[model samples]
Target chain A: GMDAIKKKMQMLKLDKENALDRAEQAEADNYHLENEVARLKKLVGER
Target chain B: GMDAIKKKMQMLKLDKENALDRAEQAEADNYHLENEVARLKKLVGER
Candidate 1:
């Protein structure tokens, strides 16, 4: 039945949403680390 | 029915467009963080 089609679409949407959340978290973590490195480099260059 | 098709089109458009901004932000954040980590490592090497 077409009901199954609708259900599948809903499931796909949920999965995509969860995936997007995880991707965003990973992206944020990466940004934080990059900033830390830039700070360290500046400290060493000054020495 | 045409109504159902119209509804589905709207849903698809909304979902796709809403995700683009988020995806771009995540990409930029990830790049920034990676650069920071590299800078930190360079600091340690000079010490």
Candidate 2:
């Protein structure tokens, strides 16, 4: 199933310059995106 | 030096709860606060 395939795949890459700052910012961005995604998912699931 | 000490210090811990969710919420909050801070900083910096 696509769901199974999706669950098996996650990808990430990092740039070297300002590594720590970029990573921190990316981590923060990931959190924000996940929250928004989860909220949207919940809304759709609840509908 | 105090600057060196400050530069060397970084701490983080992950709790056993819904960590992803918590991190996501925190990130969103951080971004919102950062925007506010930047706006205020610019306002003050301009002064």
Q: In candidate 1, which residue pairs get closer than 3 Å at backbone N, Cα or C atoms, i.e. clash? A: A30-B33, A31-B33, A34-B33, A34-B36, A34-B37, A35-B36, A37-B36, A37-B39, A37-B40
Interface RMSD of each: 3.7, 17.5
lDDT at B3 for candidate 2?
Answer: 42
Model 1: per-residue lDDT, tens digit, B1-47? 45575577567556644665666677677777666566566657743
What C-alpha lDDT, on a 0 to 100 scale, does residue B9 get in candidate 1?
51
Query: Can you tell me which runs of candidate 1 are displaced by over 4 Å?
Result: A45-47, B1-13
Against the true structure, what is model 1's DockQ? Answer: 0.29
> Per-residue lDDT tens digits of candidate 2, residues A3-44?
443332211111122344444675767666556545444544
Residue pairs that clash (backbone atoms under 3 angstroms), model 2: none
Q: What is the DockQ of candidate 2?
A: 0.03
Q: Pick the TM-score winner.
A: 1
DockQ, each predicted model: 0.29, 0.03
